[PDB]
Structure 1
Amino acid sequence: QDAYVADVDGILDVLRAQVLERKPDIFQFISKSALSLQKCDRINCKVKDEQKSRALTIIVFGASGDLAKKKTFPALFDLYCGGLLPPEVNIIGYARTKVDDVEKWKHETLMKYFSNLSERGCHAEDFLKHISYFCGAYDSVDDFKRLDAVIREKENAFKGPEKGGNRLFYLALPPSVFASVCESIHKGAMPQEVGGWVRVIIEKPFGRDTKSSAELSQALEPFFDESQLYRIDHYLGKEMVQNIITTRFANRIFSAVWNASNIACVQITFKETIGTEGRGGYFDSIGIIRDVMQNHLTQILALLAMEKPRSLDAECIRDEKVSVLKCIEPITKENCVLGQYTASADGSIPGYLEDVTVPEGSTCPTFAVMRLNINNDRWAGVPFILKAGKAVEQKYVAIRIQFRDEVHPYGEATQRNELVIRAQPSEAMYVKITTKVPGDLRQTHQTELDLTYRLPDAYESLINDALLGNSTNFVRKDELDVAWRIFTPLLHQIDSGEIKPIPYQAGTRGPKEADEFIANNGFKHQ
């Protein structure tokens, strides 16, 4: 083995490069990079006794679609491998296209997208056995009755104590067919009277403005109520929400500074390096604000800014999400800077307008910075900045709370404290403070305190949440309405051409004007 002399040398070569980049004050850095450089098992079932007590069926509508096959089904697979699905779980992919060989479909359409991880891949065949294919319409009651019978079949065979069955319907569909699917389920394939709940996950967009969103909510409410309805936002992780709620509400120190008299500004940032990737045509209808800001970032804001919930029960948290959103003034055009990406320097990302499926003269924003004003006692005069961008300089999602400076007495020997909650590209939560350096008090150091102590990922966390019936991280009907009332005037102004996106090059941070806007609305760089 003269290839043992080699591989360890490469290991060392990597450690070397890590330390010379970071430049620690070195033994301990090597120690904690060696362990980050490492970082046929039976599935132990981690499911509650209520979950194993009744049959479960999960029906994914749109099963051969890109969302369902690249995201939903792999997610369910991960949950299965993690023991978070009951042992006798039934999953049915429902789609409109006839399939000769369902077993081929399973291998070719689903297994292809399963995590090729060693400790996952060897469960794939066992997982496929829990999956059926079902071919039907999304609007024909008789097809749902035929579905109902296929399910009752599996339910009534359940090797377990309670009768009937729980049914989770995942609508991996365009919003245009939701009303008809829901009506079809109502009439055709609700759970057996003998026992079981019905839950329905629906995907964005939830309309594109107050009116359209309300119309869609009125179209669904006669069939499913807010205990049954689960408007999923894929990006909102369990781990970041615990960061937002526990760190603050369980602690006097953080509770006491979480307000107007101690906070200079709050910024919620969503950054990706990817562009639209050929699908510009679809995005051109939606734009960055509707895509992630009115939904994802606003739910983050809500959770960050809410008053204290009467309890940690899901609907109490949702009540407070609603109340704080109700205090937010509609965003004005003057508090909004738009961007539209041009080609990256290496051309790996063609310009947004180079996409043939984007119509000539498109003014669609791929980037947006804006300021929200929360008019209540806790937040009055505190700038909340939402920032979202495609084809910018890195992949990143974080909350940055910047606290007011203590001018006296440290002056320039201190700077504003920050609390950062990051979810991407990895989870971190930390406070920047100034501390002494180990004669003069004026000699100080900015330091970062880590507050953060294979778990499921954000999307998997939400599906698990829906299976356990925890509504916390899902936008409720009333919450949604209020969110649309924050953004809709701005969207009208943008659709009437009153704001124009500034071109930025893909791979850069975005328009210089967006950074100046942040610095003009209460943020200091230091």
Structure 2
Amino acid sequence: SDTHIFIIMGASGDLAKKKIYPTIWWLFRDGLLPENTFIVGYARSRLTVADIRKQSEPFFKATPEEKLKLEDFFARNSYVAGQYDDAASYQRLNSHMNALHLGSQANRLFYLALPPTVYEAVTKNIHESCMSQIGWNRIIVEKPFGRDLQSSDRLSNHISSLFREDQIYRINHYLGKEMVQNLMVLRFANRIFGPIWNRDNIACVILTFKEPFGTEGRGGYFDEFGIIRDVMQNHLLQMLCLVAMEKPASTNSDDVRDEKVKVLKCISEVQANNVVLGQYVGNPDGEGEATKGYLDDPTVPRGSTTATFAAVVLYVENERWDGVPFILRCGKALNERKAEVRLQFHDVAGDIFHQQCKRNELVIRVQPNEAVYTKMMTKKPGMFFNPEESELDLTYLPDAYERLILDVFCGSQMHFVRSDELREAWRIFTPLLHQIELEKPKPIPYIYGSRGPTEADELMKRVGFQYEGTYKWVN
């Protein structure tokens, strides 16, 4: 078995200490990492391994039973202090990596837990000095991947000029979730969902990502990006790609991402008449943080028109999806947390039940709870021939971040955004973002803890989604 080096650049970061070190700790605890794996930190701060332990222990969730295993894990941890644009520091880091046991032929896995501003310099210096000559070299890149098409293209071209596509792992936490990964099996392993997954049967597709909390203090970081860049551009667009994607030639990462980019290439730029933007305000009847609006945050610049809610309608102009509205819906400070995929089917042609039938709906809920159910019509128990709404419910381990790190280790790139997919997403959403920043349109206020602006429901009804509300469900 080959040896591996997990280089954590910016190991002093909050993201590092709270998510990366605990994740590799759990992976080593479960015996999932390669046996010969060395964790090497790298940041400008003068820190030590004890200095690390002190900062990472309360997030480690370490019970006293496995203190020996924790000591064994932290034995292989090491830290190098250096600057992100200092060739001498990068040479020192490379020398230290070669100083570890069998470090010259080790597989190098650099995790860039850094702000995007230093990504170019870090990648350039890594490619210059710290690349292994025998093993592979894979780089984990964190969002944001630029703020528009031009900046994203600049960063992507800089990274791609040095590293191959198989060496770049743009990490998205949402792509590793079980229901998100179950979408391909649900679609392509079942005959029941095959013939109906087209424009001849589906009336509209609704993709939802709701959060019940606001900016909760760190509103200044969210102000410069907005909800479209936060959620719509990546989460909902990956959901759309999985829902609308053709069947791949195989389960290979290249084939899956080829289908995803092919679907993305058939989407036109978003227009402002298909977009509803909202910004949450305080709830006087609420408790705690519900009473504070988006602008009530001191870190948020005054007079900000950043949208905390967005509802856009996309169209995939291909054979399978021509004319089917794809409604992307997300927001913050909403009434509940939910990540959902909903397919509303057309009315049954030649209805013989006197307009009593409702549209079939297939729902794939990703969170809070995993649930795949289809709403369908069934005969009402009684005397007359009246259908009523019913439902078929689907009846029925490392977490998503751990599986993503294991995917980087094992070379599976199907859960990571490719360069062409990123370019297509940015080209889809860039004219709208440019118009928004140029004109500063006022978002529609909505009360903290509500469902959002009513204009979103109006847009859904206009594009084709008919909400009934008469469907009653009991657990």
Band the TM-score falls in, shorter-chain normalisation? over 0.9
Q: 2:128 aligns with which of 187, 199, 202?
A: 187
Question: Does 2:409 align with 1:485?
Answer: no
Aligned to 1:500: 442
Report the 3-state secondary structure (helix = DSSP H, G, I; strand = E; otherwise coil) of the residue aligned with 2:416: coil
Separation (CA, whole Å) in 2 of partners of 1:510 and 1:164:
55
Report the 3-state secondary structure (helix = DSSP H, G, I; strand = E; otherwise coil) of the residue aligned with 2:439: coil
Q: Judging changes above 3 Å, is the alpha-carbon distance between structure 1 residues 118 and 238 closer, same or farther for their aligned structure 2 residues?
A: farther
Q: Judging changes above 3 Å, is the alpha-carbon distance between structure 1 residues 143 and 509 closer, same or farther for their aligned structure 2 residues?
A: same
Q: How does 1:1-150 map to 2 (within 5 A)?
A: 53-99=1-47, 101-103=48-50, 105-115=51-61, 123-150=69-96
Q: 1:372 aligns with which of 305, 314, 322?
A: 314
Q: TM-score, normalised by structure 2?
A: 0.93
Question: Does 2:360 align with 1:417?
Answer: yes
Residue 82 of structure 1, CA deviation:
2.9
Separation (CA, whole Å) in 1 of partners of 2:69 and 2:387:
54
Maintained 8 Å contact 1:111/1:124: no
Maintained 8 Å contact 1:232/1:462: yes
Residue 494 of structure 1, CA deviation:
0.9
Maintained 8 Å contact 1:78/1:120: no
Equivalences, count: 464
Residue 281 of structure 1, CA deviation:
1.2
Is 343-352 or 480-489 further displaced after alignment? 343-352
Separation (CA, whole Å) in 2 of partners of 1:395 and 1:81:
31
In structure 1, runs of 5+ residues without a counterpart are: 1-52, 158-162
Q: Judging changes above 3 Å, is the alpha-carbon distance between structure 1 residues 448 and 81 closer, same or farther for their aligned structure 2 residues?
A: farther
Aligned to 1:522: 464
Aligned to 1:279: 218
Separation (CA, whole Å) in 1 of partners of 2:311 and 2:203:
17
Aligned to 1:213: 152
The amino acid that maps onto 1:189 is C
Q: Judging changes above 3 Å, is the alpha-carbon distance between structure 1 residues 380 and 440 closer, same or farther for their aligned structure 2 residues?
A: farther
Q: Judging changes above 3 Å, is the alpha-carbon distance between structure 1 residues 450 and 115 closer, same or farther for their aligned structure 2 residues?
A: farther
Residue 501 of structure 1, CA deviation:
0.7
Maintained 8 Å contact 1:166/1:198: yes
The amino acid that maps onto 2:447 is Q
Separation (CA, whole Å) in 2 of partners of 1:199 and 1:236:
19
Separation (CA, whole Å) in 1 of partners of 2:389 and 2:30:
40
In structure 2, runs of 5+ residues without a counterpart are: 469-475
Q: Judging changes above 3 Å, is the alpha-carbon distance between structure 1 residues 276 and 118 closer, same or farther for their aligned structure 2 residues?
A: farther
Question: Does 2:392 align with 1:449?
Answer: yes
Separation (CA, whole Å) in 2 of partners of 1:411 and 1:173:
62
Cα deviation 1:327-368 (Å, max 9, x = unaligned): 101000000000101123224242110111111110000110
Identity %: 52
Is 332-341 or 505-514 further displaced after alignment? 505-514
Report the 3-state secondary structure (helix = DSSP H, G, I; strand = E; otherwise coil) of the residue aligned with 1:406: coil
Residue 521 of structure 1, CA deviation:
1.8
Maintained 8 Å contact 2:180/2:366: no
Separation (CA, whole Å) in 2 of partners of 1:520 and 1:154:
63
Aligned to 2:247: 308
Aligned to 2:473: none
Question: Does 2:296 align with 1:348?
Answer: no
Maintained 8 Å contact 1:372/1:383: yes
Maintained 8 Å contact 2:3/2:35: no
The amino acid that maps onto 1:132 is S
Separation (CA, whole Å) in 2 of partners of 1:121 and 1:416:
57
Maintained 8 Å contact 2:112/2:142: yes
Residue 370 of structure 1, CA deviation:
0.7
Question: Does 2:106 align with 1:165?
Answer: yes
Q: Judging changes above 3 Å, is the alpha-carbon distance between structure 1 residues 148 and 375 closer, same or farther for their aligned structure 2 residues?
A: same
Report the 3-state secondary structure (helix = DSSP H, G, I; strand = E; otherwise coil) of the residue aligned with 1:254: coil
The amino acid that maps onto 2:467 is H
Q: TM-score, normalised by structure 1?
A: 0.84
Maintained 8 Å contact 2:8/2:41: yes
Residue 441 of structure 1, CA deviation:
6.1
Question: Does 2:124 align with 1:178?
Answer: no
Q: Judging changes above 3 Å, is the alpha-carbon distance between structure 1 residues 148 and 430 closer, same or farther for their aligned structure 2 residues?
A: same
Maintained 8 Å contact 2:152/2:423: yes
CA RMSD for the aligned pairs? 2.0
Separation (CA, whole Å) in 1 of partners of 2:347 and 2:11:
53
Residue 201 of structure 1, CA deviation:
0.6
Separation (CA, whole Å) in 1 of partners of 2:45 and 2:144:
24
Residue 304 of structure 1, CA deviation:
1.3
